[PDB]
Amino acid sequence: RSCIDTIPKSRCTAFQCKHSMKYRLSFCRKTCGTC
Ligand SMILES: [Li+]
Ligand code: NA
């Protein structure tokens, strides 16, 4: 898979990566280090 975020960068916060599976696995795969 390509490793990008699919929402605007400034939405991909440390807090959302910690507390939302949606952010980790769908919206912010790059910023949350899912890839
Ligand atoms: Li996850
Ligand atoms: Na992107």
UniProtKB/Swiss-Prot annotation:
It comes from Stichodactyla helianthus. Changing residue 20 to Q/R: More than 25-fold decrease in potency of inhibition of Kv1.3/KCNA3. GO terms for cellular component: extracellular region; nematocyst. InterPro entries: ShKT_dom. This is Kappa-stichotoxin-She3a. It is found in: Secreted; Nematocyst. Its main location: secreted. The record marks 22 as: Key residue for binding both Kv1.2/KCNA2 and Kv1.3/KCNA3 (occludes the channel pore like a cork in a bottle). Residues 3-35 form the ShKT domain. GO terms for molecular function: potassium channel regulator activity; toxin activity. Changing residue 11 to Q: 7.5- to 42-fold decrease in potency of inhibition of Kv1.3/KCNA3. Changing residue 23 to Q/R: More than 25-fold decrease in potency of inhibition of Kv1.3/KCNA3. Negative results: does not show or very weak activity on Kv1.5/KCNA5, Kv3.1/KCNC1, and Kv3.4/KCNC4 (IC(50)>100 nM). Peptide with both antimicrobial and neurotoxin activities. Inhibits voltage-dependent potassium channels. Potently blocks Kv1.1/KCNA1 (IC(50)=6.7-87 pM) and Kv1.3/KCNA3 (IC(50)=10-250 pM). Less potently blocks Kv1.4/KCNA4 (IC(50)=0.31 nM), and Kv1.6/KCNA6 (IC(50)=0.16 nM). Shows moderate activity on Kv1.2/KCNA2 (IC(50)=9 nM), Kv1.7/KCNA7 (IC(50)=11.5 nM), and KCa3.1/KCNN4 (Kd=0.03-30 nM). Blocks Kv channels by binding to a shallow vestibule at the outer entrance to the ion conduction pathway and occluding the entrance to the pore. Disulfide bonds join 3-35, 12-28, 17-32. Keywords: Antibiotic, Antimicrobial, Disulfide bond, Ion channel impairing toxin, Nematocyst, Neurotoxin, Pharmaceutical, Potassium channel impairing toxin, Secreted, Toxin, Voltage-gated potassium channel impairing toxin. The record marks 7, 9, 11, 20-21, 23, 27 as: Important residue for binding Kv1.3/KCNA3.
